[PDB]
Design an enzyme around this catalytic site. Structure first.
Site, PDB file in Angstrom:
ATOM      1  N   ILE A  65       0.853  -1.166   0.000  1.00  0.00           N
ATOM      2  CA  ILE A  65       0.000   0.000   0.000  1.00  0.00           C
ATOM      3  C   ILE A  65       0.895   1.223   0.000  1.00  0.00           C
ATOM      4  O   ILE A  65       1.811   1.305   0.839  1.00  0.00           O
ATOM      5  CB  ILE A  65      -0.923  -0.005   1.249  1.00  0.00           C
ATOM      6  CG1 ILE A  65      -1.750  -1.303   1.243  1.00  0.00           C
ATOM      7  CG2 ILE A  65      -1.801   1.274   1.241  1.00  0.00           C
ATOM      8  CD1 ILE A  65      -2.756  -1.342   2.422  1.00  0.00           C
ATOM      9  N   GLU A  66       0.659   2.168  -0.919  1.00  0.00           N
ATOM     10  CA  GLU A  66       1.542   3.341  -0.991  1.00  0.00           C
ATOM     11  C   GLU A  66       1.285   4.186   0.249  1.00  0.00           C
ATOM     12  O   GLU A  66       0.142   4.497   0.600  1.00  0.00           O
ATOM     13  CB  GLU A  66       1.318   4.098  -2.287  1.00  0.00           C
ATOM     14  CG  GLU A  66       2.394   5.137  -2.597  1.00  0.00           C
ATOM     15  CD  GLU A  66       2.191   6.406  -1.749  1.00  0.00           C
ATOM     16  OE1 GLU A  66       1.032   6.884  -1.690  1.00  0.00           O
ATOM     17  OE2 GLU A  66       3.166   6.899  -1.145  1.00  0.00           O
ATOM     18  N   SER A  67       2.364   4.570   0.912  1.00  0.00           N
ATOM     19  CA  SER A  67       2.242   5.164   2.201  1.00  0.00           C
ATOM     20  C   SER A  67       1.485   6.500   2.271  1.00  0.00           C
ATOM     21  O   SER A  67       0.656   6.690   3.194  1.00  0.00           O
ATOM     22  CB  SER A  67       3.648   5.295   2.693  1.00  0.00           C
ATOM     23  OG  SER A  67       3.603   5.739   3.977  1.00  0.00           O
ATOM     24  N   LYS A  68       1.769   7.440   1.365  1.00  0.00           N
ATOM     25  CA  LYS A  68       1.031   8.684   1.381  1.00  0.00           C
ATOM     26  C   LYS A  68      -0.466   8.443   1.201  1.00  0.00           C
ATOM     27  O   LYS A  68      -1.279   9.058   1.915  1.00  0.00           O
ATOM     28  CB  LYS A  68       1.549   9.690   0.372  1.00  0.00           C
ATOM     29  CG  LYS A  68       0.811  11.072   0.433  1.00  0.00           C
ATOM     30  CD  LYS A  68       1.412  12.148  -0.464  1.00  0.00           C
ATOM     31  CE  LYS A  68       0.770  13.472  -0.150  1.00  0.00           C
ATOM     32  NZ  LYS A  68      -0.299  13.843  -1.123  1.00  0.00           N
ATOM     33  N   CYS A 166      13.482   8.027  -0.996  1.00  0.00           N
ATOM     34  CA  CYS A 166      12.162   7.500  -1.305  1.00  0.00           C
ATOM     35  C   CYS A 166      11.807   7.728  -2.761  1.00  0.00           C
ATOM     36  O   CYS A 166      11.886   8.830  -3.252  1.00  0.00           O
ATOM     37  CB  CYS A 166      11.176   8.229  -0.390  1.00  0.00           C
ATOM     38  SG  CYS A 166       9.415   7.832  -0.625  1.00  0.00           S
ATOM     39  N   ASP A 173      14.940   8.146   3.306  1.00  0.00           N
ATOM     40  CA  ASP A 173      14.457   6.958   4.052  1.00  0.00           C
ATOM     41  C   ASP A 173      15.517   6.743   5.140  1.00  0.00           C
ATOM     42  O   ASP A 173      16.687   6.759   4.791  1.00  0.00           O
ATOM     43  CB  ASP A 173      14.481   5.724   3.105  1.00  0.00           C
ATOM     44  CG  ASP A 173      13.553   5.861   1.897  1.00  0.00           C
ATOM     45  OD1 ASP A 173      13.963   5.428   0.764  1.00  0.00           O
ATOM     46  OD2 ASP A 173      12.407   6.352   2.059  1.00  0.00           O
ATOM     47  N   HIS A 205      10.722   0.906   1.087  1.00  0.00           N
ATOM     48  CA  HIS A 205      11.275   0.172   2.210  1.00  0.00           C
ATOM     49  C   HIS A 205      11.159  -1.319   1.996  1.00  0.00           C
ATOM     50  O   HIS A 205      12.133  -2.070   2.179  1.00  0.00           O
ATOM     51  CB  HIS A 205      10.571   0.528   3.517  1.00  0.00           C
ATOM     52  CG  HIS A 205      10.612   1.997   3.900  1.00  0.00           C
ATOM     53  ND1 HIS A 205      11.319   2.916   3.247  1.00  0.00           N
ATOM     54  CD2 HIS A 205       9.950   2.671   4.910  1.00  0.00           C
ATOM     55  CE1 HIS A 205      11.140   4.105   3.820  1.00  0.00           C
ATOM     56  NE2 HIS A 205      10.316   3.948   4.848  1.00  0.00           N
ATOM     57  N   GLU A 206       9.994  -1.743   1.534  1.00  0.00           N
ATOM     58  CA  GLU A 206       9.698  -3.156   1.276  1.00  0.00           C
ATOM     59  C   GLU A 206      10.667  -3.704   0.227  1.00  0.00           C
ATOM     60  O   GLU A 206      11.248  -4.784   0.414  1.00  0.00           O
ATOM     61  CB  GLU A 206       8.260  -3.325   0.825  1.00  0.00           C
ATOM     62  CG  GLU A 206       7.194  -2.832   1.823  1.00  0.00           C
ATOM     63  CD  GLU A 206       6.773  -1.362   1.648  1.00  0.00           C
ATOM     64  OE1 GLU A 206       7.591  -0.474   1.278  1.00  0.00           O
ATOM     65  OE2 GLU A 206       5.587  -1.100   1.913  1.00  0.00           O
ATOM     66  N   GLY A 235       5.043  10.751   7.295  1.00  0.00           N
ATOM     67  CA  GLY A 235       3.638  11.115   7.414  1.00  0.00           C
ATOM     68  C   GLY A 235       2.863  10.353   8.470  1.00  0.00           C
ATOM     69  O   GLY A 235       1.708  10.060   8.276  1.00  0.00           O
TER      70      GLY A 235
HETATM   71  C1  LIG Z   1       9.094   6.236   0.066  1.00  0.00           C
HETATM   72  N1  LIG Z   1      10.078   5.473   0.718  1.00  0.00           N
HETATM   73  C2  LIG Z   1       7.757   5.752  -0.022  1.00  0.00           C
HETATM   74  C3  LIG Z   1       6.725   6.519  -0.520  1.00  0.00           C
HETATM   75  N2  LIG Z   1       5.604   5.813  -0.498  1.00  0.00           N
HETATM   76  C4  LIG Z   1       5.908   4.545   0.016  1.00  0.00           C
HETATM   77  N3  LIG Z   1       5.016   3.517   0.218  1.00  0.00           N
HETATM   78  C5  LIG Z   1       5.481   2.417   0.715  1.00  0.00           C
HETATM   79  N4  LIG Z   1       4.600   1.319   0.932  1.00  0.00           N
HETATM   80  N5  LIG Z   1       6.743   2.249   1.022  1.00  0.00           N
HETATM   81  C6  LIG Z   1       7.628   3.248   0.854  1.00  0.00           C
HETATM   82  O1  LIG Z   1       8.847   3.051   1.180  1.00  0.00           O
HETATM   83  C7  LIG Z   1       7.201   4.467   0.319  1.00  0.00           C
END
Ligand SMILES: *C(N)c1c[nH]c2nc(N)[nH]c(=O)c12
Ligand SMILES: NC(=O)c1ccc[n+]([C@@H]2O[C@H](COP(=O)([O-])OP(=O)(O)OC[C@H]3O[C@@H](n4cnc5c(N)ncnc54)[C@H](OP(=O)(O)O)[C@@H]3O)[C@@H](O)[C@H]2O)c1
Ligand SMILES: *[C@@H](N)c1c[nH]c2nc(N)[nH]c(=O)c12
Lengths: 259, 261
Positions: A65-68, A166, A173, A205-206, A235
């Site tokens: 899942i995209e973090s933002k 990132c 990161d 990160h994953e 965030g």
């Molecule tokens: C940046 N490292 C970033 C931006 N959106 C992200 N989503 C996820 N799931 N992992 C990340 O590392 C992300």
């Protein structure tokens, strides 16, 4: 400003896994452990509630899942009334599972569950205090070539020096990473240089943890390997990917100093 | 190429802009400080090997300026690819640069991550006011919620809430905080106080500004003999701000983090 599951954006794990030349039968098992520091909603009477969410997404899910988008989805709870903490938990499991494509585990914990909990560091030997010179900041997986030449060992190493940029925002990161393995003993200088070489590399990160796992596997060929990284939040949410030969989940989830 | 060390990134904001809106004079009704935690501090040693640390900063509430948070984050990122001979140099530069920006000497500690092992997550002092059976439907800021709020017997009390939220002025995301209020005065009505704190929810604030407004509103509506208002907010961009304002006290005893921080 109300609850909106459409804000979640999945990203398929296959994009980077194909770049790592993995088949659909994975070399690892594991999960992505997320901490949601800012979870907040209104109770049935409109009074704000706050909690910390602890989420686990299986590494076999089609999508991360995209973090933002995850942050914005959580923000859509902020002004929405829910009947109970159980309703919030239920909605999170449903929406996050649908996005990831496999059942996600969710614990919604009151803030008093954290009082007096200690900060932890990682296990085993820290590899960071080396008097070495770094000549460039280009990613180089060949820094691991010939890195595992020692006698058979089982040991745990870690570093606090993991950094990458990132992919979608170009913001740093920051992570600590723990590496537990059974195999030929690894050269500490090579492992540290390899990790430092991520510093200006675009990553999620994953996928960074999957790259470290698969590079160690190919270059160092341990018999058993576990890589667990703990990243600082972005965030209000952090991600802690866990990838292992044999283990499905870590046996501890505790916050580190920078998290 | 990443930008390297750049003190020009720091952005001062005069504290007096918002204080004027609170109808304060140059002679302040409070004393205190803004404590910042810098969770992401990292630089290179002289051989190019990364270093990581956590910083702690105290900025006096009498400083002419506060430091705008996004600019502080960008300033700290400028260290990430810069080589420094020693940790002492990093600490000395932070003191110099942040003092020049604030307008008054600030204190800085740069601590190795190992100093944090076994450090606790903490709650706040006194009684939590959050578990109330009340209905809220209007989230608009209203200081008049405090009218007549302190009618009770003269008491010394400490109260806290985890329900402080506002909207971050410049960057426009939610602010999340807990707030501790210690006072000696007529006992405060807890429903009025909680409604007042929740009324920040959709209001544009800086953290420092919100604590000074809380202090000045409680002073004017409740007239305690002594008062301290201390809020601890979750980080934005790797840094957090914990403003402390008091009639009689100088600073909190430690900088221990709370659950969401
Ligand atoms: C940046 N490292 C970033 C931006 N959106 C992200 N989503 C996820 N799931 N992992 C990340 O590392 C992300
Ligand atoms: C994901 O990645 C997103 C990017 O962040 P964004 O929505 O803020 O857009 P943005 O303006 O592009 O933010 C970029 C970076 O600036 C930081 N930042 C933003 N406002 C800040 C402030 N007032 N003080 C200190 N740092 C600040 C963000 O921190 P945060 O990591 O806390 O957002 C983020 O790390 C995160 O918000 C999250 O949704
Ligand atoms: C939002 N809450 C915000 C954005 N910049 C800020 N700077 C400072 N010093 N305080 C804040 O609350 C800020």
């Amino acid at each position: 400003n109300q609850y909106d599951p459409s804000l979640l954006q999945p990203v398929p794990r296959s994009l980077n896994r194909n770049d790592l030349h993995l088949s659909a039968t994975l070399p690892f098992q594991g999960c992505d452990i997320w901490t949601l520091y800012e979870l907040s909603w209104l109770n049935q009477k409109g009074l704000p509630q706050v909690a910390i969410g602890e989420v686990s997404i299986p590494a076999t899910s089609a999508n991360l899942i995209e973090s933002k988008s995850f942050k914005l989805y959580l923000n859509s709870y902020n002004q929405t009334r829910f009947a109970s903490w159980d309703e919030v938990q239920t909605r999170l499991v449903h929406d996050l599972s649908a996005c990831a494509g496999e059942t996600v585990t969710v614990n919604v914990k009151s803030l008093n569950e954290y009082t007096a909990e200690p900060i932890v560091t990682m296990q085993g030997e820290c590899i960071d205090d080396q008097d070495i010179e770094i000549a460039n900041y280009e990613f180089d997986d060949a820094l691991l070539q010939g890195a595992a030449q020692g006698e058979e060992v089982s040991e745990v190493l870690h570093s606090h020096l993991l950094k990458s940029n990132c992919l979608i925002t170009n913001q740093p990161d920051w992570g600590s990473v723990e590496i537990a393995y059974h195999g030929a003993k690894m050269n500490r200088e090579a492992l540290l240089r390899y990790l430092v070489s991520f510093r200006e590399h675009n990553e999620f990160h994953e996928q960074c943890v999957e790259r470290i796992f698969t590079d160690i596997m190919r270059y160092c060929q341990p018999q058993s390997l576990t890589v667990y990284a703990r990243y600082t939040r972005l965030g209000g949410l952090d991600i802690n990917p866990f990838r292992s030969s044999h283990q499905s989940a870590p046996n501890h989830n505790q916050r580190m100093a920078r998290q």
